[PDB]
CSV table of C-alpha atoms and ligand atoms in Angstrom, one decimal:
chain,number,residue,atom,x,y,z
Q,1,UNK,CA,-10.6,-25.8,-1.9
Q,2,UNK,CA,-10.8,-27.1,1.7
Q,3,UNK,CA,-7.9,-29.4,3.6
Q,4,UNK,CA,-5.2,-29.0,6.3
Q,5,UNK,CA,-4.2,-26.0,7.2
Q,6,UNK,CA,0.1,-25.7,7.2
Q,7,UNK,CA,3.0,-23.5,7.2
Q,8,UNK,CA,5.1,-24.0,4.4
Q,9,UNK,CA,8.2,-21.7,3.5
Q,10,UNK,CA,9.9,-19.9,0.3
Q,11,UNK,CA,11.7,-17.3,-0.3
Q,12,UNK,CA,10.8,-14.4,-1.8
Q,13,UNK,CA,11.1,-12.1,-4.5
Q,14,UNK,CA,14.2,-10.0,-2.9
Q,15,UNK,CA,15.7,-13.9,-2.2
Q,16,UNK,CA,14.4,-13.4,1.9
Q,17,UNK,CA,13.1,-16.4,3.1
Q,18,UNK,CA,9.3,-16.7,5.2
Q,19,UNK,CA,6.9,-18.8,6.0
Q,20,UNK,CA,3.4,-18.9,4.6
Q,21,UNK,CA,0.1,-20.5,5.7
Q,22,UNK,CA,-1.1,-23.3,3.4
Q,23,UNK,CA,-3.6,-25.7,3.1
Q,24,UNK,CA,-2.8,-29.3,2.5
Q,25,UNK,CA,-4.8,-31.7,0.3
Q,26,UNK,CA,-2.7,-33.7,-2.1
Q,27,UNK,CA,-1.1,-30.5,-3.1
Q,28,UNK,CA,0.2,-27.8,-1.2
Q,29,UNK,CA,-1.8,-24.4,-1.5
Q,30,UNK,CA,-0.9,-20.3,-1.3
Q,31,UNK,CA,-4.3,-20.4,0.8
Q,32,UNK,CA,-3.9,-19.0,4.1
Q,33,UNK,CA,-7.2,-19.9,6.4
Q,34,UNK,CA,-5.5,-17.9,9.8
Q,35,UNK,CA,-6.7,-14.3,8.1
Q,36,UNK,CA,-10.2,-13.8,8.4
Q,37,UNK,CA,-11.8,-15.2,5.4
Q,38,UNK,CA,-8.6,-16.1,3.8
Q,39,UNK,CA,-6.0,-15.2,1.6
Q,40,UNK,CA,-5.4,-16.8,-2.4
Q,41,UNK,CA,-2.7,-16.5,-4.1
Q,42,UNK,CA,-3.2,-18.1,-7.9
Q,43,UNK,CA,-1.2,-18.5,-10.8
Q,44,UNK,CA,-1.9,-16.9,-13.6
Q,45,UNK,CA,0.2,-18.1,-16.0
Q,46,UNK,CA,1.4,-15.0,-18.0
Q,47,UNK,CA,-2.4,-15.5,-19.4
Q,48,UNK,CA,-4.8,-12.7,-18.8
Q,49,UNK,CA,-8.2,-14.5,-17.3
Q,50,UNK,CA,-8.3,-14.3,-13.9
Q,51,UNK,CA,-7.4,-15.1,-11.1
Q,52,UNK,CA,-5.9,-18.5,-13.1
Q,53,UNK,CA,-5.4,-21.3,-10.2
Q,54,UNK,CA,-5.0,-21.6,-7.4
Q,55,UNK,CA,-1.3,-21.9,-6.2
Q,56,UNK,CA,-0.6,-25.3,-5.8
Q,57,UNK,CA,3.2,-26.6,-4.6
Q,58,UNK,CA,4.0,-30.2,-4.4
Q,59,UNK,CA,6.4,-29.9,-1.3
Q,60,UNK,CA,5.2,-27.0,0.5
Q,61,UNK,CA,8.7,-25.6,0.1
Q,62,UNK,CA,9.0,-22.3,-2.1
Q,63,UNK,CA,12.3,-21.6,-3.3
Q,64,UNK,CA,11.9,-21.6,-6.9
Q,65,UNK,CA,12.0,-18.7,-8.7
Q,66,UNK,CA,9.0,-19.1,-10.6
Q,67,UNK,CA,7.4,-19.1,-7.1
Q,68,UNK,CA,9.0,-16.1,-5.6
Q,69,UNK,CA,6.1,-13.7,-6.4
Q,70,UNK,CA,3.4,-15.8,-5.1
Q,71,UNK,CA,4.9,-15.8,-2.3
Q,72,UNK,CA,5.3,-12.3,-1.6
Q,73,UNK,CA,1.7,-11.5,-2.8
Q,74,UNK,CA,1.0,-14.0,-0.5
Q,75,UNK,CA,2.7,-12.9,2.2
Q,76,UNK,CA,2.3,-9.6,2.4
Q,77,UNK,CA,-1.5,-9.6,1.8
Q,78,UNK,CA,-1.2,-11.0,5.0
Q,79,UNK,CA,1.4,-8.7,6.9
Q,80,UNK,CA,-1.3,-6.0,5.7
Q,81,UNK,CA,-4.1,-7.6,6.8
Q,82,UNK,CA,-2.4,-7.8,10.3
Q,83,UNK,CA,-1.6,-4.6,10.0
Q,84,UNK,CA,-4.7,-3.1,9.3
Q,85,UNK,CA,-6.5,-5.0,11.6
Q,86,UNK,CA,-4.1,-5.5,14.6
Q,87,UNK,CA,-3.4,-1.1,14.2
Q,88,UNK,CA,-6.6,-0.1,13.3
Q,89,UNK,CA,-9.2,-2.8,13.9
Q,90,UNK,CA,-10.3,-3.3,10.3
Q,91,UNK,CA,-10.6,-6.7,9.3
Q,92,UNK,CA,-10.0,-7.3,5.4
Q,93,UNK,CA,-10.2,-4.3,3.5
Q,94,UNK,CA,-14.2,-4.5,3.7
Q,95,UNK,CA,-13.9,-4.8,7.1
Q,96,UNK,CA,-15.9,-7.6,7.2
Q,97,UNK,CA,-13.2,-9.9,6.4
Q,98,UNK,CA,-13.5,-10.4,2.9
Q,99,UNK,CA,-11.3,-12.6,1.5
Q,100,UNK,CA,-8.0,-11.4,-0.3
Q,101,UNK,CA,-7.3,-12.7,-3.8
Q,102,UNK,CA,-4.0,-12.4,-5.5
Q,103,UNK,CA,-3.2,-13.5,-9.0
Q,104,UNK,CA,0.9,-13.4,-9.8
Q,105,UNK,CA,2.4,-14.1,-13.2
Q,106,UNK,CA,-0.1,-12.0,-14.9
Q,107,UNK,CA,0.8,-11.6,-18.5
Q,108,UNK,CA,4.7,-11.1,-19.6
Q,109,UNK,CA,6.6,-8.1,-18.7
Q,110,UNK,CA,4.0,-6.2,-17.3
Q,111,UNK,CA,5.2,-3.6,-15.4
Q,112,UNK,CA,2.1,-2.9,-13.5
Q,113,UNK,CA,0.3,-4.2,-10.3
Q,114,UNK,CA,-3.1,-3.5,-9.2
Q,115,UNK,CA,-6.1,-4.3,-7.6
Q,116,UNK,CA,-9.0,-4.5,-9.8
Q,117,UNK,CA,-12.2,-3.8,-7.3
Q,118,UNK,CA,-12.1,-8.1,-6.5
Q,119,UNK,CA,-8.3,-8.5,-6.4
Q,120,UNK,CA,-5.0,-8.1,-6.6
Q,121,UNK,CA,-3.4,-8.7,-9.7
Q,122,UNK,CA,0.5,-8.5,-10.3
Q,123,UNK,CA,2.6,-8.0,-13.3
Q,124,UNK,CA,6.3,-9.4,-13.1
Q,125,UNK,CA,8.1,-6.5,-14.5
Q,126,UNK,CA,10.5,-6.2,-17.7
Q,127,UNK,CA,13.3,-7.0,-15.8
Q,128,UNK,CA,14.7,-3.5,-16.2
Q,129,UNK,CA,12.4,-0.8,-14.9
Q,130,UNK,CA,10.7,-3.4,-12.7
Q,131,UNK,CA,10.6,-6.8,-11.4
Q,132,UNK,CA,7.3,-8.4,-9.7
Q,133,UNK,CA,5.8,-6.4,-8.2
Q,134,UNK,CA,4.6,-8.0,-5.5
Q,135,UNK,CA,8.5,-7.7,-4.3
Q,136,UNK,CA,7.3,-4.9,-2.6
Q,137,UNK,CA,5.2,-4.9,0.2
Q,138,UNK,CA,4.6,-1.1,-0.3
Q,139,UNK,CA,3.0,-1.8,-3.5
Q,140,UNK,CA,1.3,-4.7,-2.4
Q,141,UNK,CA,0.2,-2.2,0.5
Q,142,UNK,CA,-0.3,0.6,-1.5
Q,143,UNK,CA,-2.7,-1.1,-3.9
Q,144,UNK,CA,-4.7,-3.0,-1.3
Q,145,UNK,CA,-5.1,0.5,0.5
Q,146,UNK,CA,-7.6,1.5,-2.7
Q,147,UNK,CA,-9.7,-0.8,-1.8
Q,148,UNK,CA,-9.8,-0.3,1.5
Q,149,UNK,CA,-10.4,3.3,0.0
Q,150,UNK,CA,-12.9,2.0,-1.9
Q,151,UNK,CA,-14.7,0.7,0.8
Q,152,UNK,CA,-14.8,3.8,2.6
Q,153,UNK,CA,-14.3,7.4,1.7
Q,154,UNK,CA,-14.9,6.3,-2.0
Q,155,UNK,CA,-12.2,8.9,-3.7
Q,156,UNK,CA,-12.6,9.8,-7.3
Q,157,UNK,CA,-8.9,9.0,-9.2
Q,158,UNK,CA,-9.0,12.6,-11.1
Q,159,UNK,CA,-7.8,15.5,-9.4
Q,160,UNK,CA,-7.2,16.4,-6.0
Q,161,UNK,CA,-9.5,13.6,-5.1
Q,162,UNK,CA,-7.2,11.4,-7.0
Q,163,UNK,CA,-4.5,12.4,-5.8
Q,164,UNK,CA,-5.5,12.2,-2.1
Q,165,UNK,CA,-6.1,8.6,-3.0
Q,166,UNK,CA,-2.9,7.9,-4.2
Q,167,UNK,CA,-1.3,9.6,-1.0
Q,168,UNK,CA,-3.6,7.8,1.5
Q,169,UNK,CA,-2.2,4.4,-0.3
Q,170,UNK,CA,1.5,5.8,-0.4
Q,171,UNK,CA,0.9,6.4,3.2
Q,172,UNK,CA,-0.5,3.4,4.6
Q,173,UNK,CA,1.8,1.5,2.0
Q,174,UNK,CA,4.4,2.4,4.2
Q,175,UNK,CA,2.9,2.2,7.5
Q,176,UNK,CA,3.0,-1.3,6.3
Q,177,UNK,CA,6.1,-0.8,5.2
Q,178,UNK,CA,6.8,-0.2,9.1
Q,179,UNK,CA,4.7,-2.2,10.1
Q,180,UNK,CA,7.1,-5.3,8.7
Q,181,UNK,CA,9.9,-3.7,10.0
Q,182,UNK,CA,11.8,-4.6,7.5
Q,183,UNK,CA,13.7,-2.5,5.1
Q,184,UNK,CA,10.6,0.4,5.5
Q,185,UNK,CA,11.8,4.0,4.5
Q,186,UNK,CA,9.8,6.8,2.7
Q,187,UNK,CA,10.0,5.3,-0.6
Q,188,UNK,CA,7.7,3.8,-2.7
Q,189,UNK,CA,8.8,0.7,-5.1
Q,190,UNK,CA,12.1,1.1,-3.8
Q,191,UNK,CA,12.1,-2.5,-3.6
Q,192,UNK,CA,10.8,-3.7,-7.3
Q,193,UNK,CA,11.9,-0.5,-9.3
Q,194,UNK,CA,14.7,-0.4,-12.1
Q,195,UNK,CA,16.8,-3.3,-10.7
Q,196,UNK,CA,20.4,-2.0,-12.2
Q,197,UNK,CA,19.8,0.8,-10.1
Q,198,UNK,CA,20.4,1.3,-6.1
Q,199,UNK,CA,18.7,4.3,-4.6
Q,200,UNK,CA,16.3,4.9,-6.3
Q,201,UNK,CA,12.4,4.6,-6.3
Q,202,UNK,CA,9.0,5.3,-8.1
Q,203,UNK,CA,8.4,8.3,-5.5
Q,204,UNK,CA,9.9,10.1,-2.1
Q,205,UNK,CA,7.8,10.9,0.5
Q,206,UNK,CA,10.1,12.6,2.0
Q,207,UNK,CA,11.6,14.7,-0.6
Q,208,UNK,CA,9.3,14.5,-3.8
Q,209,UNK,CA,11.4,16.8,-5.4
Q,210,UNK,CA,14.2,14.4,-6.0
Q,211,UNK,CA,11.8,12.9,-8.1
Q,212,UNK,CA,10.2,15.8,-9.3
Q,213,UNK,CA,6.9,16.1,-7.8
Q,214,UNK,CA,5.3,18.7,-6.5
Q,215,UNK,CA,6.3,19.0,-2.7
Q,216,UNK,CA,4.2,22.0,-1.9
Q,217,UNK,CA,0.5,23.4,-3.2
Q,218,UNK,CA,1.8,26.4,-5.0
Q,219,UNK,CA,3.7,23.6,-7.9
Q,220,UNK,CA,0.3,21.4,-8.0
Q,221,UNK,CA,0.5,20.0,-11.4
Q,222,UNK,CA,-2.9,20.9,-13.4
Q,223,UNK,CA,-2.5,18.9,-16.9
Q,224,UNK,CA,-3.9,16.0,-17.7
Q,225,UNK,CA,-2.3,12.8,-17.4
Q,226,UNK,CA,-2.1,10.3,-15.4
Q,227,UNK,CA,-5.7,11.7,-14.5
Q,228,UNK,CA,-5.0,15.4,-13.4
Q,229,UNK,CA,-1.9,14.2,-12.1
Q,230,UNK,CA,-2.5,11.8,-9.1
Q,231,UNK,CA,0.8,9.9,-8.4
Q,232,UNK,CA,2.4,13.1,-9.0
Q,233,UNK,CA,0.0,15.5,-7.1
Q,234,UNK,CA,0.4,13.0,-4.1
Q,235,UNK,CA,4.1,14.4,-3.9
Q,236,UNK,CA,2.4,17.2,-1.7
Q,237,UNK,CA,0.2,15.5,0.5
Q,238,UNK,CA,2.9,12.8,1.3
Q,239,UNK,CA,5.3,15.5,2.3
Q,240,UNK,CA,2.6,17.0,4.6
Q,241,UNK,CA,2.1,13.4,6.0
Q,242,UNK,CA,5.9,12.7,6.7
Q,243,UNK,CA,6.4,15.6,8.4
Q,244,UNK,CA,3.5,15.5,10.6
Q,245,UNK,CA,5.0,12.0,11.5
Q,246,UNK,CA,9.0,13.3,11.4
Q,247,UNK,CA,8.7,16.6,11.6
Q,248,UNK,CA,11.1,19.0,9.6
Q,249,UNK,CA,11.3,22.7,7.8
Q,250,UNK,CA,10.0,22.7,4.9
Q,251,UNK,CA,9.6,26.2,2.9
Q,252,UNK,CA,10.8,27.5,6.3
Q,253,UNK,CA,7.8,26.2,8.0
Q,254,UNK,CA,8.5,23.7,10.8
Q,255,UNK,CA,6.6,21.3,11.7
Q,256,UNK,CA,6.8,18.9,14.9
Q,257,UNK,CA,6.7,15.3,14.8
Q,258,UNK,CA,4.6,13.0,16.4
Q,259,UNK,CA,5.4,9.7,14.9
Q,260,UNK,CA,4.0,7.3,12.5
Q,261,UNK,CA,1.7,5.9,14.4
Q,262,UNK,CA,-0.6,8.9,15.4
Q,263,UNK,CA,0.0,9.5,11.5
Q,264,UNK,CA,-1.5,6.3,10.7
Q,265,UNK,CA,-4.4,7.5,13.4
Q,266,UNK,CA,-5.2,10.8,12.0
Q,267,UNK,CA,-5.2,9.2,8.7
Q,268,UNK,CA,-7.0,6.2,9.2
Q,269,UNK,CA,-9.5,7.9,10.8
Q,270,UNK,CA,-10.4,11.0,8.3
Q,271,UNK,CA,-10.6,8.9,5.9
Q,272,UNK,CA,-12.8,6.5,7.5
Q,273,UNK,CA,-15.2,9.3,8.8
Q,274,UNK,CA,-14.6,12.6,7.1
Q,275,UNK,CA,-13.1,12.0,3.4
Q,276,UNK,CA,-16.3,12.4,0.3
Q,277,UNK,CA,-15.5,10.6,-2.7
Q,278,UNK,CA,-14.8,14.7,-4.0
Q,279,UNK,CA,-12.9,15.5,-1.1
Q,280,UNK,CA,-10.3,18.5,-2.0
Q,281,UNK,CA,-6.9,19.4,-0.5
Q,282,UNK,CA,-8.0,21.8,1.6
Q,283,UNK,CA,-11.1,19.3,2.6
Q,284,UNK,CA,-8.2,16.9,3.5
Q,285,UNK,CA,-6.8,19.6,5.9
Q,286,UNK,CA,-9.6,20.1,7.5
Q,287,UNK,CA,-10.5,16.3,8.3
Q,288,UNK,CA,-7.1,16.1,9.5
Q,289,UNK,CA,-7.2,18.3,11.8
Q,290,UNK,CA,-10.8,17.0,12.9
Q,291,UNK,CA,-9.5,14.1,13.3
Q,292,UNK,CA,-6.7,15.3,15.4
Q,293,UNK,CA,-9.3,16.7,17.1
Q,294,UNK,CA,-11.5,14.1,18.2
Q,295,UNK,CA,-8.8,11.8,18.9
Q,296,UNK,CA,-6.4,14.4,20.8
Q,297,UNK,CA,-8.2,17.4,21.5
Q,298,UNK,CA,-8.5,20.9,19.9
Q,299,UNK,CA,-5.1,21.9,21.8
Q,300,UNK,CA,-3.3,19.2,21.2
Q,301,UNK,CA,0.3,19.3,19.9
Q,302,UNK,CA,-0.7,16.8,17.6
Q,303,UNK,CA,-3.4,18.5,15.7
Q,304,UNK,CA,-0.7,21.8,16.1
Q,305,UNK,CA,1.8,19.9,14.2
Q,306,UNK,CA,-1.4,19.2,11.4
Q,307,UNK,CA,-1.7,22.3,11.2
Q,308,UNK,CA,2.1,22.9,10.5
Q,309,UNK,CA,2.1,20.3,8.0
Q,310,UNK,CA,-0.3,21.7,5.4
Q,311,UNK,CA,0.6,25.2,6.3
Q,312,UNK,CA,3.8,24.4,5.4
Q,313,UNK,CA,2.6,22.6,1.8
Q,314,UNK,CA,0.4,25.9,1.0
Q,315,UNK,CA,-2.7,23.7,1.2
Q,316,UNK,CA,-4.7,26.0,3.7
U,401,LIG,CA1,8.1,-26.9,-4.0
U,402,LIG,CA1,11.8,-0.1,2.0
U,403,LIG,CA1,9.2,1.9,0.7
U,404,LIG,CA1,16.2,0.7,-8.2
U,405,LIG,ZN1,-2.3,3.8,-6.5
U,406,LIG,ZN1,-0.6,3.8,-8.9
U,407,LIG,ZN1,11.6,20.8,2.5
């Protein structure tokens, strides 16, 4: 589909109201033609093909609830796009721009969102552990981070590797998260998970604990589920990056902050340049602190307060 490009308006999944970039020809469509290649946002119709079709609105207005998700996919496929390429210069998770595909109202009560190596695809929740996923602009973050993963490092879900993986999206989910300056915290899903309750999320960044995930290296989980344990496993690489960020004591280590931005350096960058798709823990230390390295120098207080961070998570 080509036409006029235009800036509609909905609101969204959490009842917030934005604008979107269309594109107008008879219909209006969730196809955004500011953002590199684009940005498609399709109906899927509680079917399972996908990506169903294209989202097309009569009046360029989106306030019905049926349209609340699209919207958010939507939209925050493009507040990450900005993000990653305003913060870090990457243009589409490829890099080169590709386009981003989103698919909403994928089958009924799925309580699941992912992307699936082409695109995004988003459940709508049961209505009581979850609503649509794409509510949350973590998640929406979080999942397009894999690919951007993908395209990179190329991290094996299993193990540490996995579990890496997972953090690196939990991390950059909520740069994002920052990045829209709206609601952002060190939460994931706080935004989508179990409705009746406030307070709660999937997983804390900040204190994995209070979910019960391993916040240090000494409690890494060894089973087998959820493939050796990688959105529990993360719990100790996303404490290490939240403190390097915030600093804190953790295990009576104390670590220094240097904010999320040099965070979202470090990160962006080891995993750009150092990360193999086996990387370890320890391997993650040490591209951290390369990192640090080469963008701060061996001495600086930032690759110190790397240092801290895994000390203090017993990943050496
Ligand atoms: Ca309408
Ligand atoms: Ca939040
Ligand atoms: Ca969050
Ligand atoms: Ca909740
Ligand atoms: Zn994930
Ligand atoms: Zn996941
Ligand atoms: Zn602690």
């Amino acid at each position: 589909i080509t036409g006029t490009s235009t800036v509609g308006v909905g609101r969204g999944v959490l009842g917030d109201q934005k604008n979107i970039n269309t594109t107008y020809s008879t219909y209006y469509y969730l196809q955004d033609n500011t953002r590199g290649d684009g940005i498609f946002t399709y109906d899927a119709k509680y079917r399972t093909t996908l990506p169903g079709s294209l989202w097309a609105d009569a009046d360029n207005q989106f306030f019905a609830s049926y349209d609340a998700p699209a919207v958010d996919a939507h939209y925050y496929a493009g507040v990450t796009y900005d993000y990653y390429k305003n913060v870090h210069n990457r243009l589409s998770y490829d890099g080169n721009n590709a386009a981003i595909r989103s698919s909403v109202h994928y089958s009924q009560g799925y309580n699941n969102a992912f992307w699936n190596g082409s695109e995004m695809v988003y459940g709508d929740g049961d209505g009581q552990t979850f609503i649509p996923l794409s509510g949350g602009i973590d998640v929406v973050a979080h999942e397009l981070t894999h690919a951007v993963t993908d395209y990179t490092a190329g991290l094996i879900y299993q193990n540490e590797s996995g579990a890496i993986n997972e953090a690196i999206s939990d991390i950059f989910g909520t740069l994002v998260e920052f990045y829209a300056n709206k609601n952002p915290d060190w939460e994931i899903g706080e935004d989508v998970y179990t409705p009746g309750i406030s307070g709660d999320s999937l997983r804390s960044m900040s204190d994995p604990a209070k979910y019960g995930d391993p916040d240090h290296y000494s409690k890494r989980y060894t089973g087998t589920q959820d493939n050796g344990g990688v959105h529990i496993n993360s719990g100790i690489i996303n404490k290490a990056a939240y403190l390097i960020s915030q600093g804190g004591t953790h295990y009576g280590v104390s670590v220094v902050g240097i904010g999320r931005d040099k965070l979202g350096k470090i990160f962006y960058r080891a995993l750009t340049q150092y990360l193999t798709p086996t990387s370890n823990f320890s391997q993650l230390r040490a591209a951290a602190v390369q990192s640090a390295t080469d963008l701060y120098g061996s001495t600086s207080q930032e690759v110190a307060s790397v240092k801290q961070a895994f000390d203090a998570v017993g990943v050496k």
